[PDB]
């Protein structure tokens, strides 16, 4: 049952201009609030922002922001708080605060892999990384094969745009790619 989901949200200008960050937040809120009670008591969440002007994380890497540390239990209170943190970030950065031309997706991915591996150690827990981005070509990464050996975390990529990422996906087991258009069912 137990599971760990780490969210990575791309906050590049195209993500921030086309409401993809907004949409991602809305979706995270729906999903987290919709967890079963049993589930909240066994699972973990965390959130990292990639391509981000804020640099704060365990490895003190540029342009990666661990906006939510590993969190359990995933209670309603905890969820509302997490979503508020994402909301502040948007409100505070909706007026374009120096995120042009940033590429830190691979560094973010590696920080997460290191944070995860430290976090969980020898625990029997499903580990997962969910990635919200509209650029599957921006993943500065043969290298893939090193991850394919190191990462025991499956990767769910969410393409928010109407390759390196594809390669990495097929490399790691149980990985997948979805459109935003197929996350929930629109009613018509």
């Amino acid at each position: 049952s137990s599971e760990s989901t780490t969210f990575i949200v791309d906050v590049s200008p195209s993500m921030m201009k086309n409401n993809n960050v907004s949409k991602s937040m809305a979706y995270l809120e729906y999903t987290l609030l919709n967890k079963s009670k049993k589930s909240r008591k066994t699972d973990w969440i965390s959130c990292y922002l990639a391509n981000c002007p804020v640099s704060e994380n365990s490895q003190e890497i540029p342009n990666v922001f661990q906006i939510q540390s590993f969190l359990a239990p995933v209670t309603t209170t905890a969820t509302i708080g997490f979503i508020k943190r994402l909301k502040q970030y948007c409100d505070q950065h909706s007026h374009d605060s120096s995120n042009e031309g940033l590429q830190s997706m691979i560094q973010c991915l590696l920080v997460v892999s290191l944070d995860i591996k430290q976090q969980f150690q020898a625990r029997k827990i499903l580990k997962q990384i969910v990635v919200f981005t509209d650029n599957l070509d921006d993943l500065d990464i043969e290298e893939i094969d090193l991850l394919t050996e190191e990462l025991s975390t499956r990767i769910i990529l969410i393409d928010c745009g109407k390759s390196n990422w594809l390669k990495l996906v097929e490399a790691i087991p149980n990985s997948r790619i979805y459109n935003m258009n197929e996350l929930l069912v629109e009613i018509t």
């Binding site: 590696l110 920080v111 290191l114 090193l146 190191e150």
Partner: peptide, 12 residues
């Protein structure tokens, strides 16, 4: 642990 860390220093 070690491989990941050098691979990240490589990227910084």
């Amino acid at each position: 642990n070690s491989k990941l860390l050098s691979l990240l220093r490589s990227k910084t």
